[PDB]
Amino acid sequence: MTTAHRPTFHPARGGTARGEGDLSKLSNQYSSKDMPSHTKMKYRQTGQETEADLRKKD
Amino acid sequence: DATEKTRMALEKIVNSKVASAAQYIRYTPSQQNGAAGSQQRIIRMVEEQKDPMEPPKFKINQKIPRAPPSPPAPVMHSPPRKMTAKD
Amino acid sequence: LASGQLKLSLTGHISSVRAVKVSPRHPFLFSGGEDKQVKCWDLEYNKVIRHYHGHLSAVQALSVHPSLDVLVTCARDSTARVWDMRTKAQVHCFAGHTNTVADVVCQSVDPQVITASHDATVRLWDLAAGRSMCTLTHHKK
Amino acid sequence: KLRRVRKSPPEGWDLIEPTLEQFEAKMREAETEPHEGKRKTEINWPIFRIHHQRSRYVYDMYYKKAEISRELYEFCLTAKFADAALIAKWKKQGYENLCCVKCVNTRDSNFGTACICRVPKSKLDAERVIECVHCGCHGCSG
Amino acid sequence: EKGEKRKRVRNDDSADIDGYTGPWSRFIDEKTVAKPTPELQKQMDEIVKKRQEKS
Amino acid sequence: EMPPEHVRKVIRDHGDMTSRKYRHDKRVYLGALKYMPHAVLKLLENMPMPWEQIRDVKVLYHITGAITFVNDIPRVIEPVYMAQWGTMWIMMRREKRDRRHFKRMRFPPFDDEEPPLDYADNILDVEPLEPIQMELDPEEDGAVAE
Amino acid sequence: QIANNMDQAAHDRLRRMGRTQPYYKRNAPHICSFFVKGECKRGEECPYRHEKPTDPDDPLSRQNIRDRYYGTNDPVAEKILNRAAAAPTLSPPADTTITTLYIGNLGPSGAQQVTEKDLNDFFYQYGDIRCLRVLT
Amino acid sequence: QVLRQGYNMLNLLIHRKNLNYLHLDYNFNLKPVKTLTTKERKKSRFGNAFHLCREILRLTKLVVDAHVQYRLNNVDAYQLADGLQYIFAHVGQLTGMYRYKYKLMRQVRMCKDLKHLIYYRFNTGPVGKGPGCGFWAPGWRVWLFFLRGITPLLERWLGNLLSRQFEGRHSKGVAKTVTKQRVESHFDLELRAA
Ligand SMILES: O=P(O)(O)O[C@H]1[C@H](OP(=O)(O)O)[C@@H](OP(=O)(O)O)[C@H](OP(=O)(O)O)[C@@H](OP(=O)(O)O)[C@H]1OP(=O)(O)O
Ligand SMILES: [Mg+2]
Ligand SMILES: [Zn+2]
Ligand SMILES: [Zn+2]
Ligand SMILES: [Zn+2]
Ligand SMILES: [Zn+2]
């Protein structure tokens, strides 16, 4: 009987790759996509309407 | 108070974590045999200088099964709705 | 919202979208895919600028923390993961569910993260320590 | 080393040159003698010992003996016949018999201390013989 | 306590190329090398053979 | 700073890396490779301009010989440097005119199986033949010629 | 397992064998193997010891780390255990009906002698004396 | 020293892998000393980080050997300068680098442009064609600005090569993206799971 072509009747779970909570294990390889991006945050301006400004208005 | 508490712990962690990616100790030893006459020791810690050329010391792709789940929480259902013959 | 008019279509995802959140503190929109990708959209350019990589199968909820710069996403693979939306770093993996997760909601006071799962449990999480301390088992489904 | 300084040696040079040429002969041997039958430290120690002498010779000639003027002494420092960074120590009160530089350095040690050979070796211990790892110096304070 | 140093064979005329020292010192009385005599050799001599007989 | 002979001795003794006494250093020699693009960059940046026959550079080097970095940054007073290269232009054009036959050197200059030279033995005390320098006229150039 | 362990009688056995003073000689230094060959050109300067090594017949020399840590075939442990089993102790007489204990080394008569109370107020912790006699 | 050091480092990486059937000659050509089987080929093929380092060291040996040939006194002053000029423009050829870096071809073209720039003005007058234009410095600079950008790139790439070699390969669980081929089969998994 063919059985090696199994579907995901029993899917694997997260939390067990490199460094996931293991982080001292994290390993010194890191190169390609992770290294360079957007290190300074853009905070939204005052007056986004949402919690306190909406109550402030009718 | 909650928001300030949350960041301040992870912050100290993240700085060591990207690094992963005088000072003394006074030691009071319960083993009373001791240094001569001294109920405590005081001791100097220095850090081994990391050689900036030396490549990673140890193999760390060692892999072991997931740690057992925390012991089961009681299952707490309402009593089974029996629906036996027709459903 | 008022006119119902359409005014963008953003074509970055690879196979299906099913999470959207608009940040209440940054001009960013976050989205999660059955294509295993969480994307950050910058609402000053309409382009994508961050990817959060680690989910092993379809994302199906995400939440954006009301006061930290922290993002949490649920997926199949039966975990939620916590992300730092500045660096893209992943700095919790809330494994502890045993079946696919799909809801997460965040709040500033403890429990900062609440997750709901196809294992028929809700869990309440200590976002600082990364541990869980409730299992609200009362659901049958 | 004379090509490195372009001007010709000043007047005294005939006196020192026979000696300075012998220190070069020694140093070429110490560079090249076989690295086997000697500790991993010991093979470096001849280099520092000859370097110490050569600087001490130029230093003694001007300061103790006055047999070379200033202009030839300063010429020797510029030629790099003399370790003049080290000679700056020998001028100091309390360092006048120093071995190399590395033993004073402190920052290269584990505990932030100068080498052992400094340790007024009279004071150190009743009988302890020493050969410090940097240059085999037995004790260079007295 | 509430209220000699061993002597050294110094040649510190810096012109004496092949002979000098001036902080390099063997003492007027010193052992540079130390060895078992023959009786102490013969005790140790069997020890290395007993280690090789294991092979 | 410490005697130039020390790095020669270290580099000479280690150099084969069959030395098994030195085998403990082999681990550090490999890791140094990460920096080697940086060591090449600093070496070539420093390279002696054609009117210099020998240039002495300051190097930063690892106590095991594992890698040598050249610690200089070569700075120039740019009107002097433009003037110096301007005299090379004059001289190099003059030689190409006068030579009739100019033998361009062969590349690679050493055969693939020829091991690199013993520099302390071979190069160190053969005196260099003179560089490209223009004969500055001490009457017109005396502000500069010395 | 060790943190919870209860058997005070077992603890008190260990305390007796344990020894009560630190042994620095085992802490302090390595042996000069060039001196074992007999050729140590370093000799006064040496660091390492210039004294007899342990003989290769002496199984105490052999001990690994893992055997010691896991605690199997550890030669020094077996030496300690053999002396602990050799150490003398009482086992009661074959006459089952005997309930009499001789006591000795009470010291001399006079002010150094223990009183009846000093036996009464201690040995009644164990069981009911039927008769007590003293021979000062 | 940097060439000795560079030679030993790559040669030690070969031995660390235990690829004793490869030979690295003193000009940094990597030759296989025998006919590889299949498995020796799979094991030995290791190019992009290693060869770009190796070819930058090849270039450095060409330059330093030119200076060595001068210092020996068998290439005078002018033949060195023409040698150094030649090495920097014609480095496109002597660079095996072009393969791996292939954006590097931008620098090859830019030195070719400078060569025409210099040679035309240098030859102008009674000065013949052919060798002798020792005016190396414009071409030399182009490679230093190349090396500026490559230095962090190779330091990162070599750090990843070295670290996995010492640490081991950790790829046994990282998340895999779902690009073109995987997209069609991945839709059914997420469908069947749903
Ligand atoms: O590189 P060089 O040894 O200085 O030779 C160049 C080069 O000749 P090759 O590349 O064929 O070796 C030029 O070619 P390009 O590299 O610029 O394509 C060539 O130009 P041609 O292609 O027309 O032959 C030119 O010779 P010419 O003066 O005839 O243009 C000649 O320059 P020099 O003669 O001044 O050295
Ligand atoms: Mg395919
Ligand atoms: Zn000293
Ligand atoms: Zn010293
Ligand atoms: Zn010292
Ligand atoms: Zn010894």
In three state form, how does the secondary structure of chain C look?
Answer: CCCCCCCCCCCCCCCCEEEEEECCCCCEEEEEECCCCEEEEECCCCCEEEEECCCCCCEEEEEECCCCCEEEEEECCCEEEEEECCCCCEEEEEECECCCEEEEEECCCCCCEEEEECCCCEEEECCCCCCEEEEECCCCC
Q: Which residues of B touch D111 (CB under 8 A)?
A: 44, 46
The residue type found at F33 is: L
User: Residue D34: CB partners within 8 Å, gap ≥ 6?
Assistant: none
Shortest alpha-carbon distance between residue E13 and chain G (Å): 26
Indicate the SS3 state at residue C27.
coil
Q: Count CA atoms closer than 13 A to C29's CA, side-chain side.
A: 13
Q: Which of A28, C55, C77 is nearest to H175 (CA)?
A: C55
Structure tokens at H141: 């600079």
Q: Which residues pair with C122 in a beta bridge?
A: C116, C136
Q: Count CA atoms closer than 13 A to D81's CA, side-chain side.
A: 26
The answer to whether the annotation marks G46 as part of a ligand binding site is yes
CA H78-H81-H86 angle, 5° bins: 125
Helix D45-59 crosses helix D13-32 at what angle (to 10 degrees)?
170
Ligand 1 mutation pick, H117, H129, H135, H136, max ligand atoms within 8 A of CB: H129
The C-alpha atoms of residue H139 and residue H156 are separated, in whole angstroms, by 27
Q: Which residues pair with C117 in a beta bridge?
A: C101
Question: Ligand 1 centroid to H116 CA: how many Å?
Answer: 9
The DSSP symbol for C97 reads B
Q: Which of F1, F58, F3, F69 is nearest to F32 (CA)?
A: F69
Which of left, alpha, beta for C73 (phi over 0: left; psi -120 to 50: alpha)? beta
Q: Which of C87, C89, C81 is nearest to C63 (CA)?
A: C81
What is the chain D residue with the closest CA to E11?
D53
Indicate the SS3 state at residue B7.
helix
Q: Which residues of F touch D2 (CB under 8 A)?
A: none
* D102 neighbors D49 (Cβ within 8 angstroms): no
Q: Count CA atoms closer than 13 A to C79's CA, side-chain side.
A: 24
Ligand 1 pocket, residue H123 CB under 6 Å:
yes
* C85 neighbors C73 (Cβ within 8 angstroms): no
Q: Which residues pair with C124 in a beta bridge?
A: C114
Atom of ligand 1 nearest to the CA of H131: 36
Q: Count CA atoms closer than 13 A to H140's CA, side-chain side.
A: 21
Question: Ligand 2 centroid to H182 CA: how many Å?
Answer: 8
Structure tokens at G111: 């002010």
User: Residue C139: CB partners within 8 Å, gap ≥ 6?
Assistant: C120, C121, C122
Please write down the HEC assignment for all residues of D114-134: CCCCCCCCCCCCCCCCCCCCC
DSSP letters for G8-28: HHHHHHHHHHS-SS--HHHHS
Question: Ligand 2 centroid to C101 CA: how many Å?
Answer: 31
| Per-residue b or e along E17-37, where b marks 16 or more CB atoms closer than 10 Å to that residue's CB | beebbbbbbeeeeeeeebebe
Touching C: H residues 163-182, CB under 8 Å: 174-175, 177-179
* D49 neighbors F9 (Cβ within 8 angstroms): no
N- to C-terminal Cα distance for chain F? Answer: 30
The residue type found at C115 is: T
The C-alpha atoms of residue G94 and residue G97 are separated, in whole angstroms, by 9
Structure tokens at D140: 């260079």
* C88 neighbors C51 (Cβ within 8 angstroms): yes
Structure tokens at C28: 């960013």
Q: Which residues pair with C113 in a beta bridge?
A: C106, C125
The residue type found at E46 is: E
Q: Count CA atoms closer than 13 A to F137's CA, side-chain side.
A: 2
Chains D+C touching (3+ CB pairs under 8 Å): no
**Out of H4, H73, H78, whose CB is closest to F92?**
H78
Q: Which helix (H) or strand (E) holds F95?
A: helix F78-98
Question: Ligand 5 centroid to D136 CA: how many Å?
Answer: 7
Question: Ligand 1 centroid to H126 CA: how many Å?
Answer: 17
The answer to whether the annotation marks G50 as part of a ligand binding site is yes
Structure tokens at H145: 């600005």
The C-alpha atoms of residue B62 and residue H168 are separated, in whole angstroms, by 9
Helix H137-167 crosses helix H105-123 at what angle (to 10 degrees)?
160
> Residue whose CA is closest, atom 28 of ligand 1?
H129
Residue E41 sits at the chain G interface (C-beta within 8 Å) = yes
- Ligand at minimal distance from the CA of H183 is 2
What is the chain A residue with the closest CA to H174?
A17
- Cβ neighbours of G86 (radius 10 Å): 7
User: Residue E28: CB partners within 8 Å, gap ≥ 6?
Assistant: E7, E8, E9
Q: Which of D53, D39, D83 is nearest to F4 (CA)?
A: D83
Q: Which residues pair with F61 in a beta bridge?
A: F68
Q: Which of E14, F3, F2 is nearest to D97 (CA)?
A: E14
Q: Which of D37, D26, D139 is nearest to E26 (CA)?
A: D139
Shortest alpha-carbon distance between residue D101 and chain G (Å): 22
Q: What is the arrangement of strands in the sheet containing C101-106, beginning at the earlier edge strand?
A: C101-106, C113-117, C122-125, C132-136
The C-alpha atoms of residue F70 and residue F61 are separated, in whole angstroms, by 8
Ligand 1 pocket, residue H135 CB under 6 Å:
no
The residue type found at C64 is: V
- Cβ neighbours of G58 (radius 10 Å): 10
Match 């893992």 to its residue by tokens. G66
How many Cβ pairs within 8 Å bridge chains D and G?
4
Determination technique for this entry: cryo-EM
Ligand 1 pocket, residue H79 CB under 6 Å:
no
Q: Which residues of D touch B51 (CB under 8 A)?
A: none
Q: Count CA atoms closer than 13 A to G50's CA, side-chain side.
A: 16
What is the chain C residue with the closest CA to A11?
C77
Structure tokens at H74: 């068998």
Q: Which helix (H) or strand (E) holds C75?
A: strand C70-75
The DSSP symbol for H38 reads S
Q: Which residues of H touch B58 (CB under 8 A)?
A: 166-167
Match 């072509």 to its residue by tokens. A5
Among positive and negative, which fits the CA dihedral F105, F108, F113, F116? Answer: positive
**Paired sense of beta strands B24-27 and B41-44, if any:** antiparallel
* H56 neighbors H144 (Cβ within 8 angstroms): no
Structure tokens at D10: 């000043």
* G101 neighbors G131 (Cβ within 8 angstroms): no
Ligand 1 pocket, residue H134 CB under 6 Å:
no
Ligand 1 pocket, residue H93 CB under 6 Å:
no
> Phi then psi for C105, rounded to 5 degrees?
-135, 145
The DSSP symbol for D58 reads H
The C-alpha atoms of residue D76 and residue D80 are separated, in whole angstroms, by 6
Q: Which residues of C touch H187 (CB under 8 A)?
A: 15
The residue type found at A23 is: L
The C-alpha atoms of residue G97 and residue H153 are separated, in whole angstroms, by 93
Touching D: F residues 56-95, CB under 8 Å: 56
Ligand 1 pocket, residue H129 CB under 6 Å:
yes
Among positive and negative, which fits the CA dihedral D116, D122, D124, D125? Answer: positive
Q: How far is CA H22 from CA D65, E30, G40, H46, in A?
A: 62, 55, 43, 12
Match 């090396």 to its residue by tokens. H147
Q: What is the arrangement of strands in the sheet containing C70-75, beginning at the earlier edge strand?
A: C59-64, C70-75, C79-84, C90-95
Which of left, alpha, beta for B71 (phi over 0: left; psi -120 to 50: alpha)? beta
- Cβ neighbours of B46 (radius 10 Å): 11
For H6-105, list the strands marked E by DSSP.
22-24, 30-32
Shortest alpha-carbon distance between residue A13 and chain B (Å): 10
User: Residue C133: CB partners within 8 Å, gap ≥ 6?
Assistant: C111, C124, C125, C126
Structure tokens at H192: 């069947």
Interface test with F, best of D6, D32, D81, D104 (most F CBs within 10 A): D32
User: Residue H159: CB partners within 8 Å, gap ≥ 6?
Assistant: A28, A29, A31, F34
Structure tokens at F63: 């106590």
* E10 neighbors E25 (Cβ within 8 angstroms): yes
Touching B: F residues 61-80, CB under 8 Å: 62, 66-67
Helix H137-167 crosses helix H47-72 at what angle (to 10 degrees)?
130
**Out of A12, A21, A37, whose CB is closest to C130?**
A21
Q: Which helix (H) or strand (E) holds C84?
A: strand C79-84
Among positive and negative, which fits the CA dihedral F77, F79, F81, F83? Answer: negative
The DSSP symbol for B78 reads P
Question: Ligand 5 centroid to D135 CA: how many Å?
Answer: 6
Match 């006061």 to its residue by tokens. C67
Q: Which helix (H) or strand (E) holds H172?
A: none
The C-alpha atoms of residue C94 and residue C116 are separated, in whole angstroms, by 12
Alpha helix positions (H), D1-142? 13-32, 45-59, 71-79, 85-90
Q: Give the resolution in Å.
A: 3.0
**Paired sense of beta strands C101-106 and H22-24, if any:** unpaired
Structure tokens at F89: 């232009």
- Cβ neighbours of G105 (radius 10 Å): 4
Atom of ligand 1 nearest to the CA of H119: 35
Question: Ligand 5 centroid to D115 CA: how many Å?
Answer: 5
The C-alpha atoms of residue H184 and residue H186 are separated, in whole angstroms, by 5
CA A53-A57-B2 angle, 5° bins: 30
User: Residue H150: CB partners within 8 Å, gap ≥ 6?
Assistant: F37, H52, H56, H101
| Per-residue b or e along F78-95, where b marks 16 or more CB atoms closer than 10 Å to that residue's CB | eeeeeebbeebbebbbeb
* Residues, CB-to-ion distance under 5 Å, ligand 2: H 181
Match 């089961």 to its residue by tokens. B72
Residue C87 sits at the chain H interface (C-beta within 8 Å) = no
> Phi then psi for A45, rounded to 5 degrees?
-65, 155
